[PDB]
Design a protein around this ligand. Structure first.
Ligand SMILES: CC(=O)NCCc1c[nH]cn1
Ligand SMILES: CC(=O)NCCc1c[nH]cn1
Length: 222
């Protein structure tokens, strides 16, 4: 098969939590792209025909850790139906640059990790899918809140809201939101409940008061 690039020792958080090698390659059979996560020569996870089976993929910031970045993907199905939770991995920026240099993909004097992100995004497009990068012209933002007892990060992206990354990770299409309701309103915090077109209600609690304006604006976006 035709291997395009590989990254070793990537920290995968979902749908399993292991350090794994990432291989991106093109199928022998029809040229469609494949990603597999390897431990030795064992395939722990594989997703075929990424041009058909990736529903959404994005690079996302890691709160308070500018030296790292998440690569997040949702998929329709995977090899042997092993998993359903989204792929989330953590890349160390400097590590990634160094591996790209060793593979000959970037010159040794390149210092900007955004060159790695550009290469990976172009590779997706050449193979027929898209990886977004909303935090590098619509303004995306993220904040910490709770779903019940579990803390997590709520990312507001141009067409999606994501709450992560404890199981089960939540992705909502922005165009599916019908309304927002605020409750438990206090000086420092409030709760917001997003109701979707299908009538489902998603409640996020203990959101900082400073986030109200951006969230209220986001839901009213025309
Ligand atoms: C070790 C870590 O925190 N994240 C995955 C490390 C990495 C970055 N690039 C390749 N591997
Ligand atoms: C809720 C939201 O972010 N957007 C509604 C419409 C839209 C599409 N792209 C940007 N805005």
């Amino acid at each position: 098969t035709n291997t395009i690039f590989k990254l070793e020792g990537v920290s995968v958080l979902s749908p399993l939590r292991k350090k794994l090698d990432l291989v991106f390659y093109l199928s022998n059979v029809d040229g469609s792209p494949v990603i597999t996560l390897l431990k030795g020569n064992d395939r722990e996870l594989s997703i075929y025909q990424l041009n058909k089976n990736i529903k959404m993929a994005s690079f996302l910031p890691v709160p308070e850790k500018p030296n790292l970045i998440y690569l997040f993907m949702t998929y329709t199905s995977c090899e042997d139906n092993k998993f359903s939770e989204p792929v989330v991995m953590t890349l160390n920026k400097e590590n990634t640059l160094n591996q790209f240099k060793k593979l000959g993909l970037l010159d040794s004097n390149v210092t900007d990790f955004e060159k790695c992100v550009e290469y990976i995004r172009k590779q997706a497009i050449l193979t027929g899918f898209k990886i977004s990068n909303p935090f590098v012209k619509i303004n995306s933002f993220h904040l910490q809140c709770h779903r019940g007892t579990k803390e997590g990060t709520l990312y507001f992206l141009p067409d999606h809201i994501i709450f992560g990354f404890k199981k089960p990770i939540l992705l909502l299409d922005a165009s599916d939101i019908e309304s927002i309701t605020y409750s438990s309103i206090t000086r420092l915090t409030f709760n917001a409940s997003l109701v979707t077109k299908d009538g489902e209600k998603y409640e996020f609690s203990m959101i900082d008061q400073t986030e109200y304006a951006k969230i209220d604006d986001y839901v009213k976006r025309k």
